[PDB]
Coordinates of C-alpha atoms in Angstrom, one line a residue:
Chain A
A1 CA 115.1 72.7 99.3
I2 CA 114.2 69.8 96.7
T3 CA 114.0 71.4 92.8
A4 CA 111.9 68.7 91.3
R5 CA 112.3 64.8 90.3
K6 CA 109.7 62.9 87.9
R7 CA 106.9 60.4 88.0
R8 CA 105.2 58.5 85.9
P9 CA 100.8 59.5 85.8
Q10 CA 98.5 56.2 86.3
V11 CA 94.4 55.6 85.3
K12 CA 92.4 52.7 85.5
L13 CA 88.7 52.0 85.8
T14 CA 87.6 52.2 90.0
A15 CA 84.4 51.7 92.0
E16 CA 84.4 56.1 92.5
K17 CA 83.9 56.5 89.0
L18 CA 81.9 53.8 87.8
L19 CA 79.5 54.6 90.6
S20 CA 79.5 57.8 88.9
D21 CA 76.4 59.0 87.0
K22 CA 78.1 58.2 84.2
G23 CA 78.5 55.3 85.1
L24 CA 75.9 52.7 86.1
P25 CA 73.4 55.2 87.2
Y26 CA 73.7 55.7 83.7
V27 CA 72.5 52.1 82.5
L28 CA 69.5 52.7 85.3
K29 CA 68.5 55.8 83.0
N30 CA 69.3 54.2 79.5
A31 CA 69.2 50.1 79.4
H32 CA 65.2 49.5 79.7
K33 CA 64.6 52.7 77.3
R34 CA 67.2 51.4 75.2
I35 CA 67.4 47.9 74.7
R36 CA 64.6 46.1 73.2
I37 CA 64.5 42.0 72.5
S38 CA 61.4 41.1 70.8
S39 CA 60.6 37.0 69.3
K40 CA 59.9 39.1 66.2
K41 CA 63.7 38.9 65.5
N42 CA 66.1 36.4 66.1
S43 CA 68.7 35.3 68.5
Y44 CA 71.5 36.7 67.2
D45 CA 70.4 40.0 66.2
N46 CA 68.7 40.1 69.9
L47 CA 72.1 39.3 71.6
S48 CA 73.4 42.2 69.4
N49 CA 70.6 44.5 70.6
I50 CA 71.3 44.1 74.3
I51 CA 75.7 44.3 73.5
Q52 CA 75.3 47.5 71.6
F53 CA 74.1 50.0 74.3
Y54 CA 76.7 47.8 76.8
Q55 CA 79.5 48.3 74.1
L56 CA 78.6 52.1 73.8
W57 CA 78.7 52.9 77.3
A58 CA 81.6 50.9 78.2
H59 CA 83.7 53.0 75.9
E60 CA 82.0 56.9 76.4
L61 CA 82.2 55.6 80.3
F62 CA 85.6 54.1 80.2
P63 CA 87.4 53.9 76.5
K64 CA 90.9 52.6 77.4
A65 CA 89.7 49.3 77.4
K66 CA 88.3 46.6 74.9
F67 CA 84.6 45.6 75.7
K68 CA 85.8 42.2 77.1
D69 CA 88.5 43.1 79.2
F70 CA 85.6 46.2 80.5
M71 CA 83.4 43.3 81.4
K72 CA 86.5 41.0 83.1
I73 CA 87.7 44.2 85.0
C74 CA 83.6 44.7 86.3
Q75 CA 83.3 41.5 87.1
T76 CA 86.7 41.3 88.6
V77 CA 85.9 45.0 90.6
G78 CA 82.6 44.2 91.8
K79 CA 83.6 41.0 93.4
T80 CA 86.2 42.9 95.5
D81 CA 84.1 46.9 96.9
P82 CA 82.5 47.0 99.4
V83 CA 81.0 50.2 98.0
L84 CA 80.0 48.6 95.0
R85 CA 78.6 46.0 96.8
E86 CA 76.2 47.8 98.9
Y87 CA 75.2 49.9 95.9
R88 CA 74.3 47.1 94.4
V89 CA 72.4 45.2 97.3
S90 CA 70.9 49.0 97.7
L91 CA 69.0 48.2 94.0
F92 CA 67.5 45.1 95.4
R93 CA 67.1 46.6 98.4
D94 CA 64.8 49.2 96.5
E95 CA 63.5 47.0 94.6
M96 CA 61.9 44.8 98.1
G97 CA 61.2 48.0 99.0
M98 CA 58.5 48.7 96.6
Chain B
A1 CA 120.2 76.2 74.9
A2 CA 119.3 79.7 76.7
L3 CA 120.0 82.8 74.2
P4 CA 120.3 86.5 74.7
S5 CA 118.4 88.9 74.3
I6 CA 118.4 93.1 72.9
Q7 CA 115.7 96.2 72.8
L8 CA 114.3 97.0 69.7
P9 CA 113.0 100.6 68.2
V10 CA 109.0 98.3 67.7
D11 CA 106.2 97.2 69.9
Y12 CA 103.9 94.7 68.4
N13 CA 101.5 95.6 71.1
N14 CA 101.0 98.9 69.7
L15 CA 101.5 98.5 66.1
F16 CA 98.6 95.8 66.4
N17 CA 96.5 98.8 68.0
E18 CA 97.8 100.8 65.0
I19 CA 96.8 98.2 62.8
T20 CA 93.7 97.6 64.3
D21 CA 93.0 101.4 64.2
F22 CA 93.7 101.7 60.9
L23 CA 91.2 98.5 59.8
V24 CA 88.4 100.6 60.8
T25 CA 89.6 104.4 60.6
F26 CA 90.5 104.7 56.2
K27 CA 88.3 105.5 53.5
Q28 CA 89.3 106.8 49.9
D29 CA 87.2 110.3 51.3
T30 CA 89.2 112.4 48.1
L31 CA 87.5 110.1 45.5
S32 CA 84.1 111.6 46.8
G33 CA 81.6 102.5 55.2
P34 CA 85.6 102.1 55.9
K35 CA 87.6 100.9 52.7
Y36 CA 88.7 97.9 54.9
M37 CA 85.4 96.9 57.0
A38 CA 83.1 97.1 53.6
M39 CA 86.2 94.4 51.9
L40 CA 85.9 92.4 54.9
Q41 CA 81.9 92.7 54.4
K42 CA 82.4 90.8 50.9
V43 CA 84.7 88.3 52.7
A44 CA 82.4 87.6 54.7
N45 CA 79.9 86.6 52.0
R46 CA 82.2 84.8 50.7
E47 CA 82.8 87.0 47.5
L48 CA 85.8 87.7 47.8
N49 CA 88.7 85.3 49.0
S50 CA 92.1 87.9 49.2
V51 CA 92.1 91.2 51.1
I52 CA 94.6 93.9 48.7
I53 CA 96.3 96.3 51.5
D54 CA 97.3 99.2 50.3
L55 CA 100.6 100.5 51.7
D56 CA 99.3 104.0 50.1
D57 CA 96.3 103.9 52.3
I58 CA 98.8 103.1 55.5
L59 CA 100.6 106.0 53.9
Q60 CA 97.2 108.7 53.8
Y61 CA 96.2 107.5 57.5
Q62 CA 99.7 108.4 58.7
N63 CA 99.4 111.8 57.7
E64 CA 95.7 111.7 58.1
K65 CA 97.3 111.3 61.8
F66 CA 99.8 113.0 61.8
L67 CA 98.5 116.4 60.6
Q68 CA 95.7 116.0 63.7
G69 CA 99.5 116.0 65.6
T70 CA 99.8 112.3 67.0
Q71 CA 102.8 110.2 66.1
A72 CA 101.7 107.2 64.2
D73 CA 105.4 105.5 64.7
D74 CA 105.4 104.7 60.6
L75 CA 103.6 101.8 60.0
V76 CA 104.6 101.6 56.2
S77 CA 108.6 101.5 57.1
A78 CA 107.2 99.0 59.7
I79 CA 105.6 96.5 57.6
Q80 CA 108.0 97.3 54.3
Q81 CA 110.7 96.2 56.8
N82 CA 109.4 93.3 58.8
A83 CA 106.3 92.2 56.6
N84 CA 106.2 89.0 57.3
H85 CA 105.5 89.5 60.4
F86 CA 102.8 92.2 59.8
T87 CA 101.4 89.4 57.9
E88 CA 100.1 87.2 61.1
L89 CA 99.1 90.6 62.5
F90 CA 97.0 92.1 59.9
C91 CA 95.3 88.3 59.9
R92 CA 94.8 88.4 63.6
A93 CA 93.2 92.1 63.5
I94 CA 90.9 90.6 60.4
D95 CA 90.0 87.6 62.7
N96 CA 89.3 89.7 65.4
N97 CA 87.0 92.6 63.5
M98 CA 85.5 90.6 60.6
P99 CA 82.1 91.2 60.9
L100 CA 78.8 88.6 60.1
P101 CA 77.8 88.1 56.6
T102 CA 75.0 90.1 55.4
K103 CA 73.8 87.2 52.3
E104 CA 73.5 84.0 53.0
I105 CA 75.5 81.1 50.9
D106 CA 74.4 77.9 52.1
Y107 CA 76.2 77.3 55.3
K108 CA 75.4 73.7 56.0
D109 CA 77.5 72.5 53.0
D110 CA 80.9 74.0 54.4
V111 CA 83.0 70.8 56.7
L112 CA 84.8 73.1 58.2
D113 CA 81.6 74.4 59.9
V114 CA 80.1 71.5 60.3
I115 CA 83.3 70.1 62.1
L116 CA 83.9 72.8 64.4
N117 CA 80.4 73.2 65.1
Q118 CA 80.1 69.4 66.1
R119 CA 83.8 70.4 68.6
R120 CA 81.6 73.3 69.4
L121 CA 78.8 71.1 71.0
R122 CA 81.4 68.5 72.7
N123 CA 82.7 71.4 74.6
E124 CA 79.7 72.6 75.7
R125 CA 78.4 69.4 76.9
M126 CA 82.0 69.3 78.5
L127 CA 82.4 72.6 80.1
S128 CA 78.6 72.0 81.1
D129 CA 80.4 68.8 83.4
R130 CA 78.4 66.7 81.9
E131 CA 91.1 79.0 71.2
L132 CA 88.5 76.5 70.1
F133 CA 90.7 75.8 67.2
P134 CA 94.3 77.0 65.5
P135 CA 93.1 80.4 63.5
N136 CA 94.1 79.3 59.9
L137 CA 91.4 76.6 59.9
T138 CA 88.4 79.3 60.3
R139 CA 91.0 81.9 58.1
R140 CA 89.2 81.6 54.0
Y141 CA 90.9 84.2 52.8
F142 CA 94.7 85.5 51.8
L143 CA 96.4 88.3 52.4
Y144 CA 98.4 90.5 50.6
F145 CA 100.1 94.1 50.8
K146 CA 100.5 96.1 47.9
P147 CA 103.6 98.3 47.4
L148 CA 104.2 102.2 47.5
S149 CA 102.9 104.0 44.6
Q150 CA 105.6 106.3 43.0
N151 CA 104.9 109.8 44.4
Chain C
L1 CA 103.0 79.2 117.9
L2 CA 104.4 79.3 113.8
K3 CA 107.0 81.7 113.4
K4 CA 108.6 80.2 110.1
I5 CA 106.2 79.0 107.1
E6 CA 107.0 77.9 103.9
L7 CA 104.9 75.8 101.3
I8 CA 106.2 74.7 98.0
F9 CA 103.3 74.1 95.6
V10 CA 104.1 71.8 93.7
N11 CA 101.0 70.6 92.1
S12 CA 97.3 71.3 92.2
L13 CA 93.8 69.4 92.1
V14 CA 90.3 70.0 91.5
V15 CA 92.3 89.7 111.6
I16 CA 95.8 89.1 113.3
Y17 CA 99.0 86.8 113.1
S18 CA 101.0 88.4 115.1
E19 CA 103.2 85.1 115.7
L20 CA 104.6 84.6 112.0
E21 CA 107.7 86.5 111.4
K22 CA 108.4 84.3 107.6
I23 CA 106.6 84.0 104.8
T24 CA 107.8 81.6 102.0
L25 CA 105.3 81.2 99.1
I26 CA 106.8 79.2 96.1
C27 CA 104.7 77.7 93.5
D28 CA 105.2 75.7 89.8
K29 CA 103.9 78.9 87.4
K30 CA 102.9 75.7 85.1
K31 CA 101.1 73.9 87.7
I32 CA 99.4 77.0 89.5
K33 CA 96.8 79.3 88.0
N34 CA 95.9 81.5 91.1
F35 CA 97.3 83.3 94.1
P36 CA 97.0 80.2 97.2
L37 CA 96.9 83.3 100.2
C38 CA 95.7 86.1 98.4
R39 CA 92.7 86.9 100.5
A40 CA 94.8 85.8 103.6
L41 CA 97.4 88.5 102.5
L42 CA 94.8 91.5 101.8
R43 CA 92.5 90.5 104.6
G44 CA 95.1 90.1 107.8
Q45 CA 97.7 91.6 109.3
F46 CA 101.3 89.6 110.1
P47 CA 102.9 93.0 111.6
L48 CA 106.1 91.2 112.9
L49 CA 106.5 89.5 109.5
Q50 CA 110.1 90.3 109.4
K51 CA 110.6 88.7 105.5
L52 CA 108.4 87.8 103.0
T53 CA 108.9 85.6 99.3
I54 CA 106.6 85.2 97.3
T55 CA 107.3 83.0 93.8
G56 CA 105.6 82.1 90.9
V57 CA 102.3 82.7 91.8
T58 CA 99.8 84.4 89.4
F59 CA 97.9 87.5 90.2
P60 CA 94.4 87.9 89.4
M61 CA 93.3 90.5 86.6
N62 CA 89.7 91.3 87.7
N63 CA 91.6 92.5 91.6
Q64 CA 93.5 95.6 90.9
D65 CA 94.0 95.9 94.9
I66 CA 95.9 92.9 94.2
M67 CA 97.7 94.5 91.3
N68 CA 98.1 97.5 92.9
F69 CA 99.8 96.3 95.4
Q70 CA 97.6 97.4 98.3
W71 CA 97.8 94.3 99.9
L72 CA 101.6 94.7 100.8
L73 CA 101.4 97.9 102.6
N74 CA 99.6 95.4 105.2
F75 CA 103.3 94.9 106.2
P76 CA 105.7 97.8 108.5
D77 CA 108.5 95.7 109.6
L78 CA 109.7 94.2 106.6
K79 CA 112.8 93.7 107.0
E80 CA 113.5 91.7 102.9
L81 CA 110.6 91.9 100.6
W82 CA 111.3 88.9 97.6
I83 CA 108.9 88.8 95.0
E84 CA 110.1 86.4 91.7
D85 CA 108.3 85.1 88.2
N86 CA 104.5 86.6 89.6
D87 CA 103.2 86.6 85.8
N88 CA 100.5 89.0 85.5
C89 CA 102.6 91.8 88.3
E90 CA 104.5 95.2 87.0
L91 CA 107.3 97.1 88.8
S92 CA 105.1 100.1 87.4
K93 CA 102.8 99.2 90.1
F94 CA 105.1 98.4 92.9
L95 CA 107.1 101.9 92.2
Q96 CA 103.8 103.6 91.9
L97 CA 102.1 102.2 95.8
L98 CA 106.1 103.5 96.8
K99 CA 105.1 106.7 95.4
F100 CA 102.9 107.7 97.5
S101 CA 103.2 105.8 101.1
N102 CA 106.0 105.5 103.3
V103 CA 104.8 102.1 103.4
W104 CA 108.2 100.6 105.2
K105 CA 110.0 102.2 108.5
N106 CA 112.9 100.1 107.3
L107 CA 113.4 97.3 104.4
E108 CA 117.3 96.3 104.6
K109 CA 116.9 94.0 101.1
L110 CA 114.5 94.7 98.3
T111 CA 114.4 91.5 95.8
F112 CA 111.8 92.3 92.7
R113 CA 112.0 90.0 89.5
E114 CA 109.0 90.5 86.4
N115 CA 109.2 87.4 83.8
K116 CA 107.7 89.1 80.8
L117 CA 108.7 92.5 79.9
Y118 CA 106.3 95.0 80.3
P119 CA 106.3 98.4 78.8
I120 CA 109.3 100.4 79.8
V121 CA 109.3 102.0 83.6
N122 CA 110.8 105.4 84.2
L123 CA 111.1 106.8 87.6
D124 CA 107.9 108.6 88.1
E125 CA 109.3 111.6 89.7
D126 CA 105.9 114.2 88.7
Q127 CA 105.2 115.5 92.2
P128 CA 101.9 116.7 91.4
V129 CA 100.0 119.6 93.0
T130 CA 96.2 119.4 93.7
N131 CA 96.4 123.4 93.1
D132 CA 99.7 125.6 93.6
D133 CA 97.3 127.0 96.8
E134 CA 97.7 123.3 98.0
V135 CA 100.6 121.4 99.4
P136 CA 102.3 119.4 96.6
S137 CA 102.0 115.3 97.2
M138 CA 105.4 114.1 99.3
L139 CA 107.0 111.4 97.5
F140 CA 108.0 108.7 99.5
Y141 CA 110.5 107.2 97.6
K142 CA 113.5 108.4 99.5
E143 CA 111.9 107.6 103.2
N144 CA 110.7 103.9 101.3
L145 CA 114.0 102.9 100.3
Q146 CA 116.4 105.2 101.9
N147 CA 117.4 101.9 103.8
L148 CA 118.4 99.3 101.7
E149 CA 121.3 97.5 101.5
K150 CA 120.8 94.6 98.5
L151 CA 118.5 95.8 95.5
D152 CA 117.8 93.6 92.9
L153 CA 116.0 94.0 90.2
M154 CA 116.8 91.3 87.5
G155 CA 114.8 91.2 84.3
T156 CA 112.2 94.3 85.6
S157 CA 112.6 96.5 82.9
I158 CA 113.7 99.0 84.5
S159 CA 114.9 102.1 82.2
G160 CA 119.0 103.1 83.2
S161 CA 117.6 106.5 83.6
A162 CA 115.0 105.7 86.3
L163 CA 117.9 104.1 88.4
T164 CA 120.5 107.6 87.7
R165 CA 117.2 109.3 88.9
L166 CA 117.3 107.0 92.0
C167 CA 120.7 108.2 92.7
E168 CA 120.5 111.3 92.2
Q169 CA 117.3 112.2 93.7
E170 CA 119.7 110.0 96.3
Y171 CA 116.0 107.7 97.3
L172 CA 118.6 105.1 97.0
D173 CA 121.3 105.9 99.9
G174 CA 124.9 104.7 98.9
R175 CA 126.3 104.8 102.1
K176 CA 123.9 102.0 102.7
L177 CA 123.5 100.3 99.6
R178 CA 126.3 97.1 99.3
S179 CA 124.9 94.6 96.2
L180 CA 123.1 95.7 93.2
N181 CA 121.7 93.5 90.7
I182 CA 120.5 94.6 87.6
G183 CA 120.9 92.0 85.4
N184 CA 118.3 90.7 82.4
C185 CA 117.0 94.6 82.3
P186 CA 116.3 95.0 78.4
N187 CA 116.2 98.7 79.1
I188 CA 119.6 99.3 79.9
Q189 CA 122.0 101.3 77.6
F190 CA 125.1 102.6 78.9
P191 CA 126.8 106.2 77.8
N192 CA 129.3 104.6 75.5
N193 CA 126.4 103.8 73.1
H194 CA 125.1 105.9 70.0
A195 CA 122.2 103.4 69.8
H196 CA 119.7 104.5 72.4
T197 CA 116.4 106.1 73.3
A198 CA 118.0 108.7 75.7
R199 CA 116.3 107.8 78.9
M200 CA 117.2 104.2 78.8
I201 CA 120.8 105.7 79.2
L202 CA 122.9 104.6 82.3
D203 CA 125.5 107.1 83.7
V204 CA 127.5 105.0 85.6
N205 CA 130.2 107.8 86.6
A206 CA 126.7 109.9 88.1
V207 CA 125.6 106.2 90.1
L208 CA 128.8 105.2 91.1
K209 CA 129.6 108.4 92.4
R210 CA 126.1 108.2 94.5
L211 CA 126.8 104.4 96.3
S212 CA 130.7 104.0 96.4
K213 CA 130.7 101.5 99.1
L214 CA 128.9 98.2 97.2
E215 CA 130.7 95.0 97.1
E216 CA 128.7 93.1 95.0
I217 CA 127.6 93.6 91.3
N218 CA 125.5 91.5 89.2
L219 CA 125.0 92.6 85.4
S220 CA 124.4 89.0 84.2
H221 CA 122.3 88.2 81.3
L222 CA 122.8 92.2 80.6
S223 CA 123.4 92.1 76.6
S224 CA 124.0 95.6 76.3
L225 CA 127.3 95.6 78.6
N226 CA 129.0 95.1 74.6
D227 CA 133.4 95.5 74.8
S228 CA 133.0 99.5 73.7
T229 CA 130.3 99.6 76.9
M230 CA 132.8 98.3 79.2
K231 CA 135.4 101.0 78.8
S232 CA 132.5 102.6 81.5
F233 CA 133.1 100.7 83.8
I234 CA 137.0 101.0 83.4
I235 CA 137.0 104.5 84.1
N236 CA 134.9 104.7 86.8
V237 CA 136.9 101.9 88.4
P238 CA 137.9 104.5 91.0
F239 CA 134.5 104.9 92.7
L240 CA 133.9 101.0 93.5
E241 CA 136.5 100.3 95.4
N242 CA 134.3 98.4 97.7
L243 CA 133.6 95.5 95.0
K244 CA 134.6 92.2 95.9
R245 CA 131.8 90.1 93.7
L246 CA 131.6 90.5 90.2
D247 CA 128.8 88.6 88.0
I248 CA 128.3 89.2 84.9
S249 CA 128.5 86.1 83.0
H250 CA 125.8 84.6 80.5
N251 CA 126.6 87.6 78.7
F252 CA 126.9 86.5 75.0
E253 CA 129.1 89.4 73.8
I254 CA 131.1 90.5 76.4
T255 CA 135.1 89.6 75.1
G256 CA 137.9 88.6 77.3
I257 CA 139.6 92.1 76.5
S258 CA 137.2 93.9 78.0
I259 CA 137.3 91.8 81.4
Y260 CA 141.0 91.6 81.6
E261 CA 141.8 95.1 81.2
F262 CA 139.2 96.2 83.6
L263 CA 140.8 93.5 85.8
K264 CA 144.3 95.3 85.2
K265 CA 142.7 99.0 86.3
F266 CA 141.1 97.1 89.2
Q267 CA 144.8 95.9 89.9
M268 CA 145.4 99.4 90.0
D269 CA 143.7 99.7 93.3
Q270 CA 145.5 93.3 95.1
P271 CA 142.6 90.8 93.1
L272 CA 139.5 91.1 92.7
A273 CA 137.9 88.8 95.2
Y274 CA 135.8 86.9 93.0
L275 CA 134.0 87.0 89.4
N276 CA 131.6 85.0 87.1
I277 CA 132.0 84.7 83.2
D278 CA 129.6 81.3 83.3
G279 CA 128.3 80.9 79.9
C280 CA 130.2 84.2 78.3
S281 CA 130.9 82.3 74.6
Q282 CA 133.0 84.8 73.6
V283 CA 136.2 85.1 76.5
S284 CA 138.9 83.2 75.6
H285 CA 140.3 80.1 77.5
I286 CA 143.9 81.8 77.2
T287 CA 142.8 84.6 78.4
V288 CA 140.8 83.3 81.3
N289 CA 143.9 81.0 82.3
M290 CA 145.7 84.3 81.8
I291 CA 143.8 85.7 84.5
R292 CA 144.4 82.3 86.8
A293 CA 147.6 82.7 86.2
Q294 CA 148.7 86.0 86.8
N295 CA 146.4 86.0 90.0
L296 CA 144.1 89.1 89.1
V297 CA 141.1 87.5 90.5
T298 CA 140.8 85.5 93.9
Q299 CA 138.7 83.1 92.4
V300 CA 137.2 82.8 88.7
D301 CA 134.6 80.6 87.3
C302 CA 134.3 79.8 83.7
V303 CA 132.3 76.8 83.1
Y304 CA 131.1 77.2 79.2
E305 CA 128.8 74.2 79.3
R306 CA 126.9 75.8 82.1
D307 CA 123.4 76.5 79.9
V308 CA 121.3 78.7 83.1
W309 CA 121.7 80.6 86.3
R310 CA 119.3 80.2 88.1
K311 CA 120.8 78.3 91.0
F312 CA 117.2 77.0 93.0
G313 CA 117.8 78.7 97.2
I314 CA 120.6 79.8 96.5
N315 CA 119.8 82.6 93.2
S316 CA 116.5 82.2 92.9
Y317 CA 113.0 81.1 94.8
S318 CA 111.2 80.3 91.5
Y319 CA 110.0 77.0 91.6
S320 CA 112.8 74.4 89.1

């Protein structure tokens, strides 16, 4: 019987991983706590105040890709997964149920 | 590339046990804790950076054990024959046995303590589902074999 | 309805079974870090199980019932046992089982191969008495091993005296034994060696007297078989007239001198049927060409470049 023959394993960002606790639930837990926007600061600083959280979260979730590439993959997988669509509409369904 | 293999008159699991038993047992009682555990306590307090192993002590330990009737496998002859390996064995015995410090040393300024503490915190988070190092990194002392005196 | 089941657990990711006849469990020892059928094998019975083959698994440390082969008592009628590279097993615990139960009415073949060098095992011939006013414990080595045709102990750290005692006690039957593999056993020394501890000696003269009708010997990786030690085989040629197939390959010591004079005295018996000396760096090419030319062996293999011996399926069920 067959003694082993090799193959190359691979990993990428995926909707299940993006739906794990360290994915979007981490955002719902931490984003409103960590981002703060104020009229007391210029636009560049406020934009950075948004971006710093999402960049650190994106790295800690999936350290392979650059932040811009991460955003592109997030947009495309968001465009093309039913589970992620269900979760996303479920957030606003919950807000509608408030 | 395969290799043949042979049997030899040595067993390092056994000699490791012999070494650690020596290390926790011996003292120079004729001069009236165990000598080496006291020296390791001095290492723990970072007052001493060298461990000097005496082959005279291993001889007297062998003589005591042989007087008590057990065989002792002549560790002196073994570690005169292949001393390089036995530095590693003695350091493993020390890195197991070495006690905690009795005196405080302002520990927070030690880089290797800080870096391995940060590693341990991260590994606790990993192990909470949210060796630790190569041993030489944590081994501050240096170990030396002192020869047999002529007698 | 399943009679023969095989599982080859190539990777890891995170009651009565009368039907069964052959269970083959093979594992990638690097990837598999436990023992799959542990609960099933110890709890259940497989009463018609003819052959069992477990390789590459790792026995748990937390369970002396596993380590002492206590489960293995579950399977009478077990015509063959093969067990190989089971990293936390020991031949010592196995022989302790064999001491204290008539565990098997019949083994036609036994094959045990632990991987790492556990300490010396001697045949534990101690027959204790609870009191001399009470029976000595009947030692079941004879009736357990009396049936064997094939005994294979490659790599198992058995001492040479242990095997002689198996023959002097006639626990190994001889009249039924046909193939013996003791390769890669570092605790074997032959009588001509001046350097030893006496209980590592193999008395090949006694052994070959006992079990003379055997066909197939394997001494591969038996580095202790230097040219001087081969002289013991030369003088014991009269006791191995049944021998057809001789594997002594991957011996880095054995010069072509011993090979040649062994085949020459064997020729005083008609060639030896088959001989394997792959990887033996010291057999001179002209000598083995003489062996072919003068036709002292019907087939002889001299693939000097063959680094390893474990042909999967043929020689071993350890995975890859």
